[PDB]
């Protein structure tokens, strides 16, 4: 269905909606085939007149008004976000035929997890601390706007041509302890997941807790067990991680703290293959 | 936490928000305990300043910008609804020093399930079918608005002073395709409605008492449905069975259910609760 939604909500959404006659979607050029879904090359004609290469995702799941309306306000929220470490939303596209589209700036190097995993790239310790730093900044911003990411992981972080990490939103082994029992998600719950993301970065994309089942994780963490220090991770950076994995959310560091702390560490390091 | 939300959204929500200077909540006067959590007696002054007796629920979970924003958009949807068989929303209240409040018209006889389980009440077969017909009418309207309910059940239906049923807002009610795809449609609602009809005719007996919550999926796959209630007419049990057709599109629409149940209901005499 097109737009049989509440007039005031539709009015609120217009600045996020892209006119389809200003978008081309190349459904024959697929960007990635993974947990991302179906992502295609797009070309967006912006109001000033700049033709922009972009990524377009089709949202195959939406149907009822409730879903679309949920989706639209989610669009409004992300549109208001402005930060070099947070992925921008260019807009959403509502169509009479087919499910809605999400339009995003093109990220040359794809998601951070794939980038660090493949042998062709040789990021140093500093590069990986750097990437982790940028995520912390991204999350430091999001936290300020009192937004809870809820799904932080290296796969959900993007990397542009200038090697700027862009946190995107798009998982029991990434969740805080209390998220697994009380279903509570907070800014501090995101801090836990950031910890796991750091582990991912310093392992160059190893799967976390490889020898435990998804259901056994809860008791595992309650045995006081934690992720083991990655081969690239320096002693002071591993201490940071462990703080992010404290069972009492309040004990865990804020994202503002992690930024200045990780930044301190980052500066002790030299030798970089991917800058900025 | 103040409106640190999007200004354009706040503009759209304005017609649903209640100024707290026009609301008194009696936090000592609890209306219902359990399932609906903590509901309180309230008094609202409408646009024109009339006192309206209401029920007020506190939303203890809603905290971050995303949650509040969703809550607001859902309020915008509910507020637009206008049908005698759907619980209307009087408004929402965003407190600076407390979690948000939902404000609803006071329903004398509480939820439909609690009302029928009570042995003090004596609803006839015609009475139970009549209630089923009203849910159907509400769900018909909801369907016409392309709105999927997702949690249709007797416990989610309210009953006012004039004995009007008001549809308001879980695996044993879930459709076969819902339990394996996480997919909800109005056809999925039709299923839950069938289970609701079963609830009415059994006067609020718990469905599938012997099969465990996890075992339900294989049970319906095997082919077993709920047995015919002791005091359920045959043409109505037939209806339920149609509502439980494994092929989603083969199930009837709420519009047809209104027509059919209306006929079945019209063939009966004897009501202790007249709508
Ligand atoms: C060359 O390699 C790649 C380049 C890419 N370049 C840009 C974007 C890419 O992927 C995406 C990253 C994030 C999203 C995405 C973001 N935000 C939301 C929330 C949301 C909700 C409601 C309204 C609006 C937004 N969703 C639901 C999303 O799906 C979609 C994407 F396609 C790329 C992927 C690539 O390889 C896999
Ligand atoms: C005399 O006895 C009773 C009288 C009652 N009289 C009116 C309402 C009652 O219960 C409720 C019925 C429904 C709701 C309710 C409705 N719709 C939504 C969606 C929603 C989402 C987002 C924004 C706005 C709305 N929610 C989240 C709700 O909680 C809350 C209630 F408290 C009563 C309960 C009674 O005893 C059990």
From Swiss-Prot, chain A:
The entry's stated outcome for residue 53 to D is: In RCCP; constitutive autophosphorylation; causes malignant transformation in cell lines
Binding residues for ATP: 31-39, 57
Q: How is it modified after translation?
A: Dephosphorylated by PTPN1 and PTPN2.
- The chain positions of domain Protein kinase read 25-270
Record topological domains on the Cytoplasmic side:
1-276
Q: Where is the active site?
A: 151 (proton acceptor)
Record region (Interaction with MUC20):
245-276
Q: Which residues carry this modification: Phosphothreonine?
A: 214
User: Record's superkingdom?
Assistant: Eukaryota
Q: Cite the effect that the entry attributes to residue 175 to T.
A: In RCCP; somatic mutation
Q: In which tissues is it expressed?
A: Expressed in normal hepatocytes as well as in epithelial cells lining the stomach, the small and the large intestine. Found also in basal keratinocytes of esophagus and skin. High levels are found in liver, gastrointestinal tract, thyroid and kidney. Also present in the brain. Expressed in metaphyseal bone (at protein level).
Region called Interaction with RANBP9, residue ranges: 159-276
In the UniProt entry, the disease listed is: Activation of MET after rearrangement with the TPR gene produces an oncogenic protein. Defects in MET may be associated with gastric cancer.
Say which family it is in.
Belongs to the protein kinase superfamily. Tyr protein kinase family.
- Describe its function: Receptor tyrosine kinase that transduces signals from the extracellular matrix into the cytoplasm by binding to hepatocyte growth factor/HGF ligand. Regulates many physiological processes including proliferation, scattering, morphogenesis and survival. Ligand binding at the cell surface induces autophosphorylation of MET on its intracellular domain that provides docking sites for downstream signaling molecules. Following activation by ligand, interacts with the PI3-kinase subunit PIK3R1, PLCG1, SRC, GRB2, STAT3 or the adapter GAB1. (Microbial infection) Acts as a receptor for Listeria monocytogenes internalin InlB, mediating entry of the pathogen into cells.
Q: What is known of its domains?
A: The kinase domain is involved in SPSB1 binding.
Quaternary context: Heterodimer made of an alpha chain (50 kDa) and a beta chain (145 kDa) which are disulfide linked. Binds PLXNB1. Interacts when phosphorylated with downstream effectors including STAT3, PIK3R1, SRC, PCLG1, GRB2 and GAB1. Interacts with SPSB1, SPSB2 and SPSB4. Interacts with INPP5D/SHIP1. Interacts with RANBP9 and RANBP10, as well as SPSB1, SPSB2, SPSB3 and SPSB4. SPSB1 binding occurs in the presence and in the absence of HGF, however HGF treatment has a positive effect on this interaction.
What name does this protein carry?
A: Hepatocyte growth factor receptor
Species source reads Homo sapiens (Human)
Q: Which residues of the full protein are shown?
A: 1054 to 1351 of 1390
From Swiss-Prot, chain B:
Q: Which residues lie on this side of the membrane: Cytoplasmic?
A: 1-275
Catalytic residue list: 151 (proton acceptor)
The residues that hold ATP are: 31-39, 57
Q: According to the UniProt record, what happens if one changes residue 39 to I? A: In RCCP; constitutive autophosphorylation
Chain positions with Phosphotyrosine modification: 273
Superkingdom of this protein's organism: Eukaryota
Q: What is the effect of changing residue 218 to I?
A: Found in a case of cancer of unknown primary origin; uncertain significance; somatic mutation; the mutated receptor is constitutively phosphorylated and can sustain invasive cell growth in vitro
Where, subcellularly, is it found?
Answer: Membrane
Q: How is it modified after translation?
A: Dephosphorylated by PTPN1 and PTPN2. Ubiquitinated. Ubiquitination by CBL regulates MET endocytosis, resulting in decreasing plasma membrane receptor abundance, and in endosomal degradation and/or recycling of internalized receptors.
Positions carrying Phosphothreonine are 213
Name the segments for region: Interaction with RANBP9.
159-275
Tell me the segments the record calls region Interaction with MUC20. 244-275
Location of the Protein kinase domain: 25-269
Q: In which tissues is it expressed?
A: Expressed in normal hepatocytes as well as in epithelial cells lining the stomach, the small and the large intestine. Found also in basal keratinocytes of esophagus and skin. High levels are found in liver, gastrointestinal tract, thyroid and kidney. Also present in the brain. Expressed in metaphyseal bone (at protein level).
Disease annotation reads:
Activation of MET after rearrangement with the TPR gene produces an oncogenic protein. Defects in MET may be associated with gastric cancer.
Please describe the quaternary structure of this protein: Heterodimer made of an alpha chain (50 kDa) and a beta chain (145 kDa) which are disulfide linked. Binds PLXNB1. Interacts when phosphorylated with downstream effectors including STAT3, PIK3R1, SRC, PCLG1, GRB2 and GAB1. Interacts with SPSB1, SPSB2 and SPSB4. Interacts with INPP5D/SHIP1. Interacts with RANBP9 and RANBP10, as well as SPSB1, SPSB2, SPSB3 and SPSB4. SPSB1 binding occurs in the presence and in the absence of HGF, however HGF treatment has a positive effect on this interaction. (Microbial infection) Interacts via extracytoplasmic residues 25-656 with L.monocytogenes InlB; MET can bind HGF, its endogenous ligand, and InlB simultaneously. InlB probably dimerizes upon binding to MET, which encourages subsequent dimerization of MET.
Family stated for the protein in its record: Belongs to the protein kinase superfamily. Tyr protein kinase family.
Q: What is this protein called?
A: Hepatocyte growth factor receptor
Organism annotation:
Homo sapiens
**Gene designation:** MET
Covered range of the whole protein: 1054 to 1351 of 1390
């Amino acid at each position: 269905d097109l737009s049989a939604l509440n007039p005031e909500l539709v009015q609120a959404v217009q600045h996020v909606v892209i006119g389809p006659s200003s978008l081309i979607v190349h459904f024959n050029e697929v960007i990635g085939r993974g947990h991302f879904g179906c992502v295609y090359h797009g070309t967006l004609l912006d109001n000033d007149g700049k033709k922009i290469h972009c990524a377009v995702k089709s949202l195959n799941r939406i149907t009822d008004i409730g879903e679309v309306s949920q989706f639209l306000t989610e669009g409004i929220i992300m549109k208001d976000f402005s930060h070099p470490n947070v992925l921008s939303l260019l807009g959403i596209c509502l169509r009479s035929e087919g499910s809605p589209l999400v339009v995003l700036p093109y990220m040359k190097h794809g998601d951070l997890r794939n980038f660090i995993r493949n042998e062709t790239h040789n990021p140093t310790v500093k590069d990986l601390i750097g990437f982790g730093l940028q995520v912390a900044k991204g999350m430091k911003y999001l936290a300020s706007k009192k937004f809870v990411h809820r799904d932080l992981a290296a796969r959900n972080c993007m990397l542009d041509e200038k090697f700027t990490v862009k946190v995107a939103d798009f998982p029991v082994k990434w969740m805080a302890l209390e998220s697994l029992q009380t279903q509570k998600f907070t800014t501090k719950s995101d801090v836990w997941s950031f910890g796991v993301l750091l582990w991912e970065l310093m392992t160059r994309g190893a799967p976390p807790y490889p020898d435990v089942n998804t259901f056994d994780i809860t008791v595992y963490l309650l045995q006081g067990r934690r992720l083991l220090q990655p081969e690239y991770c320096p002693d002071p950076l591993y201490e940071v991680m462990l703080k992010c994995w404290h069972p009492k959310a309040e004990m865990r560091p804020s994202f503002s703290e992690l930024v200045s702390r990780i930044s301190a560490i980052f500066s002790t390091f030299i030798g970089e293959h991917y800058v900025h």
